[PDB]
Structure 1
Amino acid sequence: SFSGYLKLTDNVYIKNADIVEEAKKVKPTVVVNAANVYLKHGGGVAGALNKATNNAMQVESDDYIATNGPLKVGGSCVLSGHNLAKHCLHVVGPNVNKGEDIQLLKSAYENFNQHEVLLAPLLSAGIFGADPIHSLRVCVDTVRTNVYLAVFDKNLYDKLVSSF
């Protein structure tokens, strides 16, 4: 199962790790993607997860969007996890760099409660522009299921743990 995680609360765990490498190692039931409403996996965690699937995630996502239209900010969809996980839960956190409401970050984390255990990044962190310390606080105060957070950046990981 998951190894090397620091336990933050009853159900939240954190590790300085590349979520793609972590997914390939664990092959969890659910890996969370830091998705956008169009499921265009260009950069950040989404670009890295999609590149690891050899673009199969993007091909599946384009078919999903063609059928269903875009997701809502704060919403999610379950698609295949390809070679990374059984499923990928594509969750759209608000993108502060697009002027999206940070209050939607709690709604985004509520999607995690539909899955008993997940490997995830901090929503709205990185290229989404939100403060990762705030994202971790919303995560611990919203998610009730078992969430294993992978934080790519060591310096950010140390800051998140030391300020928790």
Structure 2
Amino acid sequence: NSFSGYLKLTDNVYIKNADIVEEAKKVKPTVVVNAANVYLKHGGGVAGALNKATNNAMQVESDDYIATNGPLKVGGSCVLSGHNLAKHCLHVVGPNVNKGEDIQLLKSAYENFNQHEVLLAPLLSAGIFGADPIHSLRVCVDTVRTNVYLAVFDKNLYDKLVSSFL
């Protein structure tokens, strides 16, 4: 495929220091993963960046989804359009540690990835969701069996994830 410049961590997990928006625009993957919240309000972090790249179409679609179906559950997901970034967007809700949500639900969140053969994704529950990114990467590797291409924006965090990997 057209994923380029990734470091192989395991048989099926790959990582790159890259902006996931820029990577999606270049590769046009079948699935890009959004780091969503249960209301699909794409205000900040990865979600805010992906939605802005779609010129707010992701938010309009999401609002219709919530009006029809109600909120997601922490650990859950839904598949919506990828707009100009991808065929599909898999919106996955990891726990937000700043809200007291149970970190054990991060494993449930990553299990959603197993329904898709290839994904471009961020580290779930990192950044503004408050979890330790080294832990998130460990759960990813121990849970996901399909092909995942992880994009980590912060170069200092990228170097720490690679250098500390077991």
TM-score by length of 1: 1.00
Q: Identify unmatched segments of 5+ residues in structure 1.
A: none
Matched residue SS, 2:37: coil
Q: Which residue of structure 1 aligns with residue 102 of structure 2? A: 101
Task: Give the RMSD, CA atoms, in angstroms.
Answer: 0.3
Question: CA-to-partner distance for each residue in 1:71-125, whole Å, 9 max, x for gaps?
Answer: 0000000000000000000000000011100000000000000000000000000
- 1:141 positional shift: 0.2
Which whole-Å CA distance do the structure 2 matches of 1:24 and 1:52 have between them? Answer: 9
Which whole-Å CA distance do the structure 2 matches of 1:12 and 1:146 have between them? Answer: 6
Which whole-Å CA distance do the structure 1 matches of 2:60 and 2:21 have between them? Answer: 18
Question: CA-to-partner distance for each residue in 1:121-160, whole Å, 9 max, x for gaps?
Answer: 0000000000000000000000000000000000000000
Which whole-Å CA distance do the structure 1 matches of 2:53 and 2:122 have between them? Answer: 16
Which whole-Å CA distance do the structure 2 matches of 1:103 and 1:145 have between them? Answer: 21
Which whole-Å CA distance do the structure 2 matches of 1:104 and 1:120 have between them? Answer: 18
- 1:59 positional shift: 0.2
Which whole-Å CA distance do the structure 2 matches of 1:67 and 1:116 have between them? Answer: 28
Q: Which residue of structure 2 aligns with residue 9 of structure 1? A: 10
Question: CA-to-partner distance for each residue in 1:48-67, whole Å, 9 max, x for gaps?
Answer: 00000000000000000000
Which whole-Å CA distance do the structure 2 matches of 1:82 and 1:153 have between them? Answer: 25
- 1:21 positional shift: 0.3
Which whole-Å CA distance do the structure 1 matches of 2:132 and 2:99 have between them? Answer: 15
TM-score by length of 2: 0.99
Which whole-Å CA distance do the structure 1 matches of 2:3 and 2:36 have between them? Answer: 23
Matched residue SS, 1:23: helix
Which whole-Å CA distance do the structure 1 matches of 2:103 and 2:93 have between them? Answer: 12
Matched residue SS, 1:100: coil
- 1:41 positional shift: 0.3
Matched residue SS, 1:24: helix
- 1:16 positional shift: 0.3
Which whole-Å CA distance do the structure 2 matches of 1:32 and 1:106 have between them? Answer: 15
Q: Identify unmatched segments of 5+ residues in structure 2.
A: none
Identity %: 100
